[PDB]
């Protein structure tokens, strides 16, 4: 019933893509050092998205979750190119608390159930990339390239039915725009599912977070606005608690 602030880091070959602005770390491109720092200053969870050349990807993603699990204590999700049960399983066993799946889940919905039966719904996070097309919310796969023809409304329902723990709701429209979260999309989805909704795409200033939590989101995923300190984590939670948002310290 508390809201969460989730720091999201894109990584490739064990490196924070386009790094960060905290000069106070020996390495501002070290995902591990950044992520532990974010944990100290009050990030509620981490989320790593790997985009490594698929040849060294599997080894590289397991290297990362191991390195991370050694140094941090808050939940963290790992995602990106996870296509089957065994890849998710070894990533969780190696340290990750949850995995984030999207395209594999749309093509094979039972993949949500298979991961959940062994690691529990809490470990399965489904990323839903939606966009408005002819007045309807549509689900997109392959990093935005494929309109699946599936309605957001139906996918959200099926994703809970299959046993997902949480849903990351990405507004494609708003991705990388600093214009605010797609609160219209969030309000559309909110009554369709009992699951936690993690809002992604559009953050630019602290009030967007208030707007998003007012819309019904249980958490907020945030990317470059964090790393380039266009928003401070402490000021944000200050702000939201001040205006009645139930955040943790």
Residue numbers in the entry: 2 to 250
Please give me the paper's original passages concerning this structure.
Computational design of KE07 involved construction of a theozyme to catalyze the chemical reaction, which was then grafted into the scaffold of imidazole glycerol phosphate synthase (HisF) from Thermotoga maritima. Catalytically essential residues from the initial design include a base (Glu101) that facilitates C−H bond cleavage, an H-bond donor (Lys222) to stabilize the phenoxide intermediate, and a π-stacking residue (Trp50), which was designed to stabilize the transition state and favor substrate binding through interactions with the aromatic ring of the substrate. This initial KE07 design (Round 1; R1) catalyzes the cleavage of 5-nitrobenzisoxazole, with 103-fold rate acceleration over the noncatalyzed reaction and a turnover rate (kcat) of 0.018 s−1.
Trp50 in the active site of KE07 is a convenient spectroscopic handle to interrogate the active site environment (a second tryptophan residue, Trp156, is invariant throughout evolution). A Trp50Ala mutation was made in KE07 R1 to assess the contribution of Trp50 to the fluorescence; the crystal structures showed no major changes to the active site nor overall fold. This showed that the overall fluorescence of the R1 Trp50Ala mutant was slightly lower than R1, which is consistent with some quenching of the fluorescence of Trp156 by Trp50, similar to what has been reported previously. The Trp50Ala mutants in R1 and R7-2 result in significant (>95%) reductions in kcat, although the KM of R7-2_Trp50Ala increased sevenfold, whereas the KM of R1_Trp50Ala was unchanged, suggesting more involvement of Trp50 in substrate binding in the evolved configuration C.
